[PDB]
């Protein structure tokens, strides 16, 4: 009985294509080379994410400072979640599918300084697999991650932001219903999926701690593109000042 197009059908259209890393595999691997290549790939994925965000109806109506703030707070969440999805979709295995030309399997995970990080990232694909998340559920959840963290004192366009966020909570519900599954358990699954969203905060906390550490380490010689370097530089003080507010579904 819906006479309008579904929001999720739009999200399917604006989802950016998978980017290639441009990794040279004719030469032996090294942790430094892989990390640098992934950082450069990340920079381009984040640029693509800006275009994506601007195509979400209402996002461009937010104050420009708010648009900026949301992307600064959630870029890692967005990147890690998409990584989890590609990894989940591509294999059966315990692998990380950063790009079609840069896949990290169990072997490559043994490279120096890579095990713990890959484990934290594999958690996302593990959870998506456990809950058998659908593409439509995934797309709605990814929007909610963009809207998952705000400044301690809120946004300038707080009222419009809240309406947009509620809209995608509703849309996530619609995706659950559209999903081929147990009808009487929709509300339980709603809890489970928003629980997963809550846990992405800790996933991001871990990945950012190591990212910040690497970014500040002058001994490792790992390159960052302008996009990530600017965001990281701007965010480090905020996490220190406690200027952050995670919007949790299941905690105060």
């Amino acid at each position: 009985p819906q006479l309008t197009p579904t929001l999720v059908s739009l999200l399917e259209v604006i989802e950016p294509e998978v980017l290639y890393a441009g990794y040279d595999s004719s030469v032996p691997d090294s942790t430094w080379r892989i990390m640098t290549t992934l950082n450069m790939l990340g920079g381009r994925q984040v640029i693509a994410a800006v275009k994506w965000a601007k195509a979400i109806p209402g996002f461009r109506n937010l104050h420009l400072d708010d648009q900026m703030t949301l992307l600064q707070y959630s870029w890692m969440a967005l990147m890690a979640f998409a990584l989890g999805w590609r990894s989940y979709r591509q294999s059966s295995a315990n692998l990380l599918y950063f790009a079609p030309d840069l896949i990290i399997n169990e072997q490559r995970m043994t490279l120096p300084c890579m095990y713990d990080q890959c484990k934290h990232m594999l958690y996302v694909s593990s959870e998506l697999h456990r809950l058998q998340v659908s593409y439509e559920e995934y797309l709605c959840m990814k929007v909610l991650l963009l809207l998952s963290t705000i400044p301690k004192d809120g946004l300038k366009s707080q009222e419009l932001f809240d309406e947009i966020r509620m809209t995608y909570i509703k849309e996530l519900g619609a995706a659950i219903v559209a999903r081929e599954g147990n009808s009487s358990q929709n509300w339980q699954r709603f809890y489970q999926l928003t629980k997963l969203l809550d846990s992405m905060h800790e996933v991001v906390e871990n990945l950012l701690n190591y990212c910040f550490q690497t970014f500040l380490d002058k001994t490792m010689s790992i390159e960052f593109p302008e996009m990530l370097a600017e965001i990281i530089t701007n965010q480090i003080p905020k996490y220190s000042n406690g200027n952050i507010k995670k919007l949790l579904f299941h905690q105060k």
């Binding site: 640029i47 800006v50 275009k51 601007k54 420009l64 648009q67 900026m68 992307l71 600064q72 302008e226 996009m227 600017e230 965001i231 530089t233 701007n234």
Partner: peptide, 12 residues
């Protein structure tokens, strides 16, 4: 700050 980000958000 985040000059490239602002640039991308504010462009046609």
């Amino acid at each position: 700050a985040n000059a490239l980000l602002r640039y991308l958000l504010d462009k046609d």
